[PDB]
Every structure is written in C-alpha cells, then in structure tokens.
C-alpha cells in the first residue's frame, strides 16, 4: 500500500497497556502460580505466549477468569516474564535465569528461551 | 534496572493483537459509526485514543458491549484509524485526509492529527 507509519506507535500502545495493568483497568483474568496471584489482560497474554494463545482460543477455557499454572512453576519467574510481556524488558540475573528459562519454555515464549540459552552457554 | 530489551517485542505484540482482531478472537466491543459496525478490543482502543480511554474508564460505560459514535463521523475515516491502531500504518490519501483528520480529532489521537495538519499545510 501507500501507507505512512508512526515508528513509536507499537511501543506507545504497549506502554499504555502496562499503565492499564498497573491501575487494574479492564484486567480480565487472574493467573495463579501456587500461593501468588497475577492479574492481566487475556489478549496481551495470548499475544506473548503460545501456551496462553492455546488456552484462550479453547472454546471452554476462553471463559475462565482464573487459570492455575503447573505447581512446578516459580512465581518470581512468572512475574519477570509477565513484566517482559508488558514492557519488552527482561530482568535476567544469575540468580533467576534457570527459573526464567524453565517458565519461558512452559509458556512457549521462544525469544526469551533463546536469550536464556545464550546467556547460560556464555557462563559455561 | 539491569534489564535487557527485545527490540521487536512491541511490534510483534501489536501484530498478534491485529491477528486476534482479524480472527474475531476475544473482541469485546462493537463500535457503531452510522450504518457500519466495527468489532475491536476495548484495551487496544483505550491505548490509542483519548476518547476511548475516557469511555472505558467510566464506571457505567466500561460495561457496554456497543458504543455509538457521533453521526457526523465518517465510517471510512474510522476504519482507516482503527487499522492504524492495530498496525501503526495510516492510509492517508488526498480523498480521505479531511475525514481522517476530523475523526482523529474526535477520537483524540494527537499524533495522527499532527501528521494530517502537516500534509494539509504542504498542499496549501
């Protein structure tokens, strides 16, 4: 087409979606990771994770307001990945990289799994 | 912080949100612009438009599944802006620029109003 494009639009949209999350505006699901609860927007979770895309395209699961993750999932790992979904920034540290990588494999977030593998390889 | 950032994340999120819109997945509102209807995600509309941000943060209006816009709004202008919200690309043409600018002023999309003003000034 003959369209023009606003370079910062996608980043500005994501920043506003994170502001809605902060302010608990139009959040429509609670993700439970053992004793912790995380509120989020189903559409953002689906846009970032192959697991959530599969869950919320299922005719029965799309209607649930609570999703319980596997008990082996670490809440801190999930929190770091949820922050990444809404900001593009990943808080990867020596002390959390194994939990983050395991959580990203479970959530099916291939680009995160890729950077974790590279950071682990560099330490070996 | 000491975060790393994935450059293409925000663009990839927006592309996936547009794929959900295409496939009518988790759309939760219909915007009516005279005889036409447009399905969308309330969160994307709020992230892009000051008018939708005000509508869906209102305690009564946040619960509506149908929103009727002012009858003076042009459906083609709205369609072009809705496509911009989900893609960052604006289909601005000599034949639609006045309707697009008027619609962006109504929807409170300041960056779009800015580029329309500049393109109009260049033609004068």
């Amino acid at each position: 087409d003959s369209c023009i494009q606003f370079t910062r639009h996608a980043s500005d949209v994501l920043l506003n979606l994170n502001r809605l999350r902060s302010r608990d505006i139009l959040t429509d699901v609670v993700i439970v990771v053992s004793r912790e609860q995380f509120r989020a927007h189903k559409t953002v979770l689906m846009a970032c994770s192959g697991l959530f895309y599969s869950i919320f395209t299922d005719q029965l699961k799309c209607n649930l307001s609570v999703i319980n993750l596997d008990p082996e999932i670490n809440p801190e790992g999930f929190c770091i990945l949820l922050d990444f979904m809404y900001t593009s920034r990943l808080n990867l540290r020596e002390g959390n990289i194994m939990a983050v990588m395991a959580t990203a494999m479970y959530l099916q977030m291939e680009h995160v799994v890729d950077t974790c593998r590279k950071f682990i390889k560099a330490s070996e | 912080d000491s975060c790393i950032q994935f450059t293409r994340h925000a663009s990839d999120v927006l592309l996936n949100l547009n794929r959900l819109r295409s496939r009518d997945i988790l759309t939760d509102v219909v915007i009516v612009v005279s005889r036409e209807q447009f399905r969308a995600h309330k969160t994307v509309l709020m992230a892009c438009s000051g008018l939708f941000y005000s509508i869906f943060t209102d305690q009564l209006k946040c619960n509506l599944s149908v929103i009727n816009l002012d009858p003076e709004i042009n459906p083609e202008g709205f369609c072009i802006l809705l496509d911009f919200m989900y893609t960052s690309r604006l289909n601005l043409r000599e034949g639609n620029i006045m309707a697009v600018m008027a619609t962006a002023m109504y929807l409170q999309m300041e960056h779009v109003v800015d580029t329309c003003r500049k393109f109009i000034k260049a033609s004068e």
Binding site: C3, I4, Q5, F6, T7 | R89, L90, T115
Partner: peptide
Amino acid sequence: WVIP
C-alpha cells in the same frame, strides 16, 4: 512518521 516514515515511509515503511
């Protein structure tokens, strides 16, 4: 704004 740019030409994509």
